[PDB]
Each structure stands twice: as structure tokens, then as C-alpha cells.
């Protein structure tokens, strides 16, 4: 089924014009590029065009950093 949203449709003196057309469809694709933003989210764009967000990078904070026991490496 298809849901059509035309909440921005207007009627003015201007000629016919297709200002905006957006869909949620997608097709198979291959990983094209990967980048990291300031929020830690790792985003990657595919061949289809979807900017899928793979995930975020966890951050851990302890109240007392001086009390952490030291492992190797």
C-alpha cells in the first residue's frame, strides 16, 4: 500500500511545478563510504542512496579514574 502526503501543496499564480518528491523505497546496494560524526555515530552510504546509520561508539566514564586497575596493552 502507498501513503501520499501532500501537506505542502500550494496553488499560486506560478506555473505547474514539482518542488519536492520524496519516497521511502530502496534497492540493493554496496557500501560506498563510511564516516564518523561528532556524536560518534558511524554513518555509511550505499549504492542505492540510503544513509544508513550503522551504530554509535560507546563511551564509558568512571567516577574515580585513579582507582582503575591496569591491565596489559
Amino acid at each position: 500500500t502507498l501513503n501520499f502526503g501532500l501537506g505542502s501543496a500550494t496553488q499560486f499564480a506560478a506555473p505547474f511545478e514539482l518542488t519536492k518528491f520524496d519516497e521511502d523505497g530502496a534497492t540493493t546496494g554496496f557500501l560506498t563510504k563510511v564516516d564518523f560524526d561528532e556524536n560518534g555515530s558511524v554513518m555509511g552510504t550505499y549504492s542505492n542512496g540510503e544513509n544508513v546509520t550503522l551504530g554509535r561508539v560507546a563511551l564509558v566514564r568512571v567516577p574515580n579514574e585513579q582507582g582503575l586497575d591496569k591491565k596489559g596493552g
Binding site: P63, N64, Q66, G67
Partner: protein, 73 residues
């Protein structure tokens, strides 16, 4: 100079007051070293996890109201 903000020094006359236990500020000892850090409860403690005694100032008035010592949180 260690450029560590948690390190303190008393220039002149006076000793730091540290309490063995948080709930007994009365039982305190005097010291001069200032190697302080936050424990797991976010209290300023010495190397031996002895709580540092401090005052409680008024919200607006700079003058401290009560002169009893209490742990600094």
C-alpha cells in the same frame, strides 16, 4: 608544579584537615600534602582514601555559615 588542579598546597600557616571516616568528621588529623582525587562517591580524598574536611558556604553570601567540618562532595 604538577599542573594538576586536584593538587593543593598551603602557602603560609595552616594544615589541611582530613577525616578517617566520612561519617565521623570529629576524628580528624592534620596534614600538609595535597595529593587529592575523587573517590567512587565523588568525595575529595587523600592517597589513603581519607576524606578531606571542608565547610559549607551560603548560596549567595560568600561567608560560610557553619564552621563545623564536613566532607567535601
Amino acid at each position: 608544579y604538577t599542573n594538576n588542579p586536584m593538587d593543593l598546597r598551603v602557602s603560609g600557616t595552616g594544615f589541611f584537615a582530613v577525616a578517617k571516616e566520612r561519617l565521623t568528621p570529629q576524628q580528624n588529623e592534620l596534614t600538609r600534602n595535597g595529593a587529592f582525587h575523587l573517590n567512587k562517591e565523588n568525595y575529595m580524598v587523600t592517597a589513603n582514601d581519607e576524606f578531606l574536611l571542608g565547610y559549607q558556604v551560603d548560596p549567595s553570601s560568600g561567608e560560610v555559615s557553619s564552621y563545623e567540618p564536613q566532607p567535601i562532595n
